[PDB]
Design a protein around this ligand. Sequence first.
Ligand SMILES: [Cl-]
Ligand SMILES: [Cl-]
Ligand SMILES: [Cu+2]
Ligand SMILES: [Cu+2]
Lengths: 464, 463
Amino acid sequence: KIEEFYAQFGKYILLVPGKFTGTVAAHDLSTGRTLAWLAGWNYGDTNPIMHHMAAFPSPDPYKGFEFIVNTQGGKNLFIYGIPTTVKEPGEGFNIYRVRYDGTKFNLVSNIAEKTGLGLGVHVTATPDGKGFAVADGQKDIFAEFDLATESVRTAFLVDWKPNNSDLKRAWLEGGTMTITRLKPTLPGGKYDYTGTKGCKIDWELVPGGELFLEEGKVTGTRQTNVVALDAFVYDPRGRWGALSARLPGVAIIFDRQDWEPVVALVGAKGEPSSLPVKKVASDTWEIKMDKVVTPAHQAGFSPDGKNFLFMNGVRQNNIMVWDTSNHADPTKWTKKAVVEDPGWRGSYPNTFHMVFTPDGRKVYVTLWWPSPTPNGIAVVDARNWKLLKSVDIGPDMHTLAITYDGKYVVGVFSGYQKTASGIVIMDTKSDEVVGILPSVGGHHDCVIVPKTVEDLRCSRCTTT
Amino acid sequence: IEEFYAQFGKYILLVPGKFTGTVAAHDLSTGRTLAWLAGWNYGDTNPIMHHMAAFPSPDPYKGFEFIVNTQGGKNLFIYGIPTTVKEPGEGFNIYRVRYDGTKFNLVSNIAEKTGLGLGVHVTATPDGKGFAVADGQKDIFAEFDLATESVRTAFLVDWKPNNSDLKRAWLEGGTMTITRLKPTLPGGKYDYTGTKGCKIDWELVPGGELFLEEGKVTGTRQTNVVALDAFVYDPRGRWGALSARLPGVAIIFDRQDWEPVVALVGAKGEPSSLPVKKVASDTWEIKMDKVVTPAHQAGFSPDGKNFLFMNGVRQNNIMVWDTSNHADPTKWTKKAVVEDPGWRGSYPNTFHMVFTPDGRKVYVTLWWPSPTPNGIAVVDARNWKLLKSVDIGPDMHTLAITYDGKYVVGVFSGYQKTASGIVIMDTKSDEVVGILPSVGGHHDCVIVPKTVEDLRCSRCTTT
Ligand SMILES: [Cl-]
Ligand SMILES: [Cl-]
Ligand SMILES: [Cu+2]
Ligand SMILES: [Cu+2]
């Protein structure tokens, strides 16, 4: 009886978005029941590509909890191989606040309509549980929002000016990244970025597809200006957040106290630890790069904040580690280790999404490949920075969460929106898969509802 | 966990999602979802994925096909989702989907091809080469040929009340008219796509049969609704039983010449049957002096010798006929009625069913509105007594069984808003072995058959 397996897992609620299913759901891992779900198209969102999410601390998640889940829109419908005849996809890019009340989900608000900012990639909660960030890699905008007031705390645009305007060499041969703090342009203090407004490229750079833009496979109005912002992850000690830009392979560290970028960490192995940021106007900063060696994927801080990880991808596939023990000065954060493996020397697998154990001693990293190679989970020693093991799971692996007692990693794989999908559970003492639960979802995320701010240190806050 | 799934065997579960808009296949041997499809990705803007049946495949893991249909229109507005949509998609599609060992492929929309948009139960024929679909807003059913995607037969069923007052329109009886339909558009197409033909604006929801007489359902032909629900097949061949929920009748059709032959009356205390009189080359009538209670699901046992029909709401019971005479459905007589004092209220309703392959037991869901736990009744199908009731979860729907007869698999659906899942029950102990998570509002579920014999225990002989 599976109840014996569920009794081991504990009282934890898994949230998942469905990508092309258009759903979001919560599953009680102590009983195997789905507690509630919501289907975006029921509400008249005609292109509900439910993408990323983060949940806030709830002292008792079974009585109620809240979360943010966002969507993509426009031509993002057409890039996963589904033979649809749709000609006019919905504009999408919604950011929804959803509250579970102990019985059902309630769609509380559409923060993208309220604020004017439609952003479609990672959603992260702040370490205090009272705000959240959302980034978008077609618009290259991110923003932090106050949850209670459903308002914008700050929003920034990041732009690339390539050294070589040749699309194939626009990143390799370097460029200048310009960071601008945005101000609302419409009545009510609203921004003008709903739906597809602001997209530099007509659809996202898909998993494993960062070089598709330079290889001429993605259309858009400002192709050589894209940086592909992906997430803003938070130092659990406070003060700093890290904005990942996939194409230049940089993590820009912002000071959340005065909302300014302070240094840019450079992913690639062999490249400097960081580059400086120069303030050039009241609201504008720049970073200059003489070259870009490789794009990058996901970033994260360890639970104590003293390590920061950034995954180089495609041209290099490795885990880059900085010593971030100096909380006072991120200009002093230096590369300390790089995890590499002879099996990672091809274009794939990419070192992808991560989750640390609460004690910080191990980090679990998904290994992504295109069809048909089985995707998996790498287990890394987060003290000596060594690969310990790799386990195969299934096609199209995405994110990992962990139960807050440290005992089980929970991941999702998503079938490239058309083949096998599921929720995988891994025991962190044996590092073996306990098994798979069925899942109708193309999830690119998953979160376990936290009870406390200390749980956010191992949630969709410190890492993606 | 591997221990858990290993017990079940290599059986694939298909589910539709209702308000999720999806259909999915789950491999019960590993826990993996093999493939899913989201209707709205194809431009179906109101994909209320409702009912389904799968056809026998020699190796489901390499490929199989099934039909899944949808509802549409204001059916979006009746499960308490606070949507601001004003113009819901027309829906009422009938999709043929093929798994190819990797993914689902949307093959065709048989509603667009034929012009018959029908949104309630889908049943495979016993030989696996055709399927029926009924609709309880339009009160039409049709049997289709799979290979040519064409209509074999189509009927309309209508009510003429004795008492035109809507509260009395069924209680005081009426005449049920059955008419063979013919296509009205060029190219042999019917004119029933979308909401065309709806006598009421949305379906009578689970447990909600008396909502129409209670004035809770808009539409232009309220007092003429019978709420056809499904066409289930005698596994011995020849006969099919069309259930009409509001008169509480199961009309038996001869598939050979497509005529109705006898009408079984569900209610306890009522005759076994009423005769069906021919009044024109394409028209038959059944006259009822009263309707005692509405009815729900119907089914034949695997050997065809028993037929069940669930009375609901005014009576909640399992009516059982002796159908052992295959030659003559006018000899089919009431032989037993399964009752329990705990079913004396309006709820629970005795609902969907599955029999064990050897015909020894039948599992019957027990439906209630929120917040009462819904469950499974286990019934001894030799002496027609209730053995056990087990509580599962809110809003229980259908049941399937693995073809080796070892596990009943069911779904519960949260009223489209609260808890849902897949439940697996061991048929030796009659205990629940586990719940698996499911993002679904499913009103159906099927395990992909390998043979025609498997259809005796699938979405063919019963709902
Ligand atoms: Cl904070
Ligand atoms: Cl047949
Ligand atoms: Cu993604
Ligand atoms: Cu239904």
